[PDB]
Structure formats: structure tokens, C-alpha cells
Amino acid sequence: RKIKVPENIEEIAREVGQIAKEMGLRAYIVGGVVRDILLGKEVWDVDFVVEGNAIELAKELARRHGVNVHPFPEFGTAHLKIGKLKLEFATARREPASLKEDLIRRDFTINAMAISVNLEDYGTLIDYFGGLRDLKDKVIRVLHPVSFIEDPVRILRALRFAGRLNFKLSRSTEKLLKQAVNLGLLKEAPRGRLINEIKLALREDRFLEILELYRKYRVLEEIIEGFQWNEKVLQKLYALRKVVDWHALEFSEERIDYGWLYLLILISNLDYERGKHFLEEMSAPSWVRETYKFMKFKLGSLKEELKKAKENYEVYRLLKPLHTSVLLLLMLEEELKEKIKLYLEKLRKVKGLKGKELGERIEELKREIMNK
């Protein structure tokens, strides 16, 4: 089968094939980028695999376009940018290696396809492992049965792609995933790589769906010491999605990385020290780490103070110093939700004295307006 290369990639794809021929090599667009092209997505980050010296191919392309190139000899890879296109060139490897050997070592069939950019078969979809069929059938399938033993981080990755795409695990892939979890393989996997994969998941639009898969396959219990699911936490996550969707819609210029809020709710029953340590392990942003500390130490008192607040100005005074994240967390409390909405939609928009005495009188005049 053949596809047309997307118009924004076509000129470079053609040129890469031409240069490859000049060098006696072959080149291919590979992997997640091919998946995303098949899913009809606009792609600006293009990954190539070269059967041969990828760095020398990249350096020649870069020379012709007058751009900087970043070589990595120990990995046989190079990176460069041409206009809006970010390009990676990698030498085929079996970890000389064939394209097929380079593809069969990847995680799932839908991520293991290639597009030839070579002169004689330009645009050919190279699909050795049933990737197009698994797209059709909406299936996440490993390339070989020992895949999760070989790299248990793929357990988490499988669930990220399943949740992102609303795909199911293949029947055997599901058995393999459950068996790897049960055997303890996830618990023993390289910590840093597991953490990196959770960081990727929390960026996903469908993070909540991914978390439901995490729950189904009992993965977080293997990773976060002392973590347990319960119905309260689960229901809070669904309540949070409604709040986040509302905030993103109504205040588009004030969006934050909402995925971290789900994480904060997830770990909200951990002891503070372990939660703090986990967020540091995750390299969480300052606002996330501060919101977590606030959640544990101060939010209880604040919820009560906000409840007791009778006039709008008091609500305003209590909410004014808070990061957006704490406001959205407060909206999970049904009795507080409308006070937060009022602050966000109305109260915060209210607009020879010197120094603070000037500020005091301004705050007095504000108080009169807000309470009306």
C-alpha cells in the first residue's frame, strides 16, 4: 500500500530519499509519526531511520539548508530543524541492522510502521507486523510475547496509548500485561523510566481514561509506596474533570497544566512526606509542589474559613493570593464551588495617600463594590 506524504513534509521527504540514493543508503519515516499521519494529524516532528550512516545523511541535508545540526555519534543519531520541521535521523539498530530489525524492537504494532521515502517506492507503507490492521481494529498489541518482561515500562505505555486512542489491549497482550504486573516485573523496573512515563501520561488530554486503565491493571500500587485507590478519590477525579473542562473553556488565556491536579488528587491520601518526595521525584513544577503542601496543611482551615465567610469581600481576601490550582481544588467542594466561580467571574475583576495607607483605602472602596 502507498500513502501520500503530508504536504508540509513532502519537500524534505523527497530530498532525504535523493540524498540517501546519492550515498547508497535507504531512508524511511518511522514510528509514532507514521501512526499520527495515518490518524490524520498535522505532524511537524518527523523521525527518520536510515539503513546506513544517519549522521552523515543529516549533516548533508543540514548543509544544503544552511541549518545547525546536532550529532550524537554514540547513538548514531542527529537532530536538526528546517523551518517549522523538527527532524531526527537515526541509524537502523537491532537493539548492519535492517529496517525490519529496527521496527520489530519497538513497543506496539501501531508504532512499528514505516513510510519509504526512497526513489523507487516512494510513499510505500511498510507494515511487517499488522499495524494497519490493529489501527482498524483499535488494538494495542506488542510485537513479541516477551515485550513486557524485556521492558516493563511498556506496561504503562500500553495504557497511555490505549487511553489516548480509546483502543483495547489485544487478548494476548492483556494476558501478558497482567502477568508481568503479577510477577512483580513492574515493581522492579528502572524507577526513572517509570516516572518519565507517568509524566508523559499526565500531559494527555485523556489522562483520566489512562488513570482508569492504571486502576484496572493495578499498576500504581506497584510504583507509589503506600498508594491505594478508593471510591472517594475516583469520584473526585471525575468531579475534577468537570471543573477543568469548565475552566479551560471559560478562561482559555489562564490554562494551566491540569494533569498535575489529577495527580494531586490521586496522592491526596498519602502521608505528606511521601507525597512531597514523589512530587520531587516527578520534578513537579513549583506551583504543583506548593499546592500539594497547601492541600495538606492549610486547605482544611481555608475550606472552613471560606464556608464561614459571609460577605463577598472576605471571600475575595481569602482567595486573592491563591494559585489557580487551589481555586480549582476548592471547586470540588460543592458548598464552596459557587463562591470560587463568583471570585473568578466577578470579584477579581473589580477595578495625599501614600504607600500602604493608599492600598488600605483602595481595599475599602473595593469592599463596598464587591458586597453589592
Side-chain angles (χ1 to χ4, degrees), residues 57-111:
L57 191 156
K59 286 170 62 176
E60 175 63 18
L61 182 67
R63 182 191 71 81
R64 296 184 188 190
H65 285 267
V67 298
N68 196 24
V69 52
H70 282 174
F72 299 91
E74 284 151 343
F75 298 105
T77 64
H79 302 77
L80 59 145
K81 188 173 183 177
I82 297 173
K84 295 290 181 175
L85 290 171
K86 294 180 63 175
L87 309 173
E88 171 189 293
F89 292 84
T91 301
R93 55 176 176 90
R94 53 175 55 88
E95 301 182 340
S98 69
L99 175 67
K100 183 170 181 186
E101 288 176 309
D102 183 87
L103 295 177
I104 202 174
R105 65 166 179 79
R106 288 160 190 265
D107 49 12
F108 310 111
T109 60
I110 62 170
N111 297 337

Side-chain angles (χ1 to χ4, degrees), residues 223-274:
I223 302 173
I224 305 173
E225 235 303 308
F227 169 81
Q228 296 179 13
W229 283 96
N230 59 63
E231 178 69 11
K232 225 77 62 56
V233 166
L234 185 60
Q235 293 308 321
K236 287 187 62 59
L237 296 174
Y238 279 86
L240 177 66
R241 178 165 71 178
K242 294 181 178 295
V243 170
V244 160
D245 289 345
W246 169 85
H247 183 260
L249 179 63
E250 298 294 327
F251 304 99
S252 67
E253 292 175 320
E254 302 180 58
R255 291 171 183 163
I256 58 177
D257 294 334
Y258 303 110
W260 292 103
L261 298 183
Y262 290 95
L263 193 72
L264 293 182
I265 294 308
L266 263 181
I267 64 168
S268 65
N269 286 326
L270 294 184
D271 294 320
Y272 166 67
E273 281 73 16
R274 46 183 167 168

Side-chain angles (χ1 to χ4, degrees), residues 352-365:
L353 293 155
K354 248 171 294 182
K356 68 173 61 179
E357 82 182 346
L358 191 156
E360 290 169 353
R361 183 50 187 168
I362 287 193
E363 291 303 301
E364 272 189 327
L365 296 175

Side-chain angles (χ1 to χ4, degrees), residues 36-209:
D36 286 347
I37 290 170
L38 290 166
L39 296 172
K41 296 163 63 69
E42 185 176 336
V43 290
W44 292 99
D45 291 13
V46 188
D47 301 330
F48 292 89
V49 163
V50 180
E51 287 171 323
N53 195 326
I55 294 177
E56 287 307 312
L57 191 156
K59 286 170 62 176
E60 175 63 18
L61 182 67
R63 182 191 71 81
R64 296 184 188 190
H65 285 267
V67 298
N68 196 24
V69 52
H70 282 174
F72 299 91
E74 284 151 343
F75 298 105
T77 64
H79 302 77
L80 59 145
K81 188 173 183 177
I82 297 173
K84 295 290 181 175
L85 290 171
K86 294 180 63 175
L87 309 173
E88 171 189 293
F89 292 84
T91 301
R93 55 176 176 90
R94 53 175 55 88
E95 301 182 340
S98 69
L99 175 67
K100 183 170 181 186
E101 288 176 309
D102 183 87
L103 295 177
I104 202 174
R105 65 166 179 79
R106 288 160 190 265
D107 49 12
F108 310 111
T109 60
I110 62 170
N111 297 337
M113 294 178 285
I115 301 163
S116 176
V117 298
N118 301 291
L119 296 182
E120 90 282 353
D121 69 339
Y122 185 86
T124 298
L125 180 66
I126 300 165
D127 179 14
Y128 296 117
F129 314 114
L132 190 61
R133 178 62 181 217
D134 285 341
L135 282 176
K136 180 178 182 172
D137 292 337
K138 299 180 171 185
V139 167
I140 301 300
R141 188 192 307 275
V142 293
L143 309 191
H144 181 287
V146 304
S147 184
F148 297 124
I149 310 173
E150 175 180 68
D151 188 1
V153 187
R154 292 175 180 150
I155 295 165
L156 296 184
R157 294 181 55 92
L159 304 185
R160 172 159 59 90
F161 292 120
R164 175 194 293 179
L165 302 171
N166 194 25
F167 281 17
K168 292 186 61 57
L169 305 176
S170 97
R171 295 174 200 101
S172 60
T173 292
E174 186 182 42
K175 291 179 189 175
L176 292 166
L177 187 149
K178 292 173 69 170
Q179 286 179 358
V181 172
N182 202 258
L183 283 165
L185 305 185
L186 187 58
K187 179 174 294 299
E188 295 170 24
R191 182 90 181 164
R193 292 188 63 239
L194 293 181
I195 276 47
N196 287 341
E197 172 54 30
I198 297 175
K199 292 164 66 176
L200 290 179
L202 75 79
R203 296 156 57 164
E204 299 279 334
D205 285 343
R206 299 276 70 78
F207 188 38
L208 183 50
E209 284 84 357

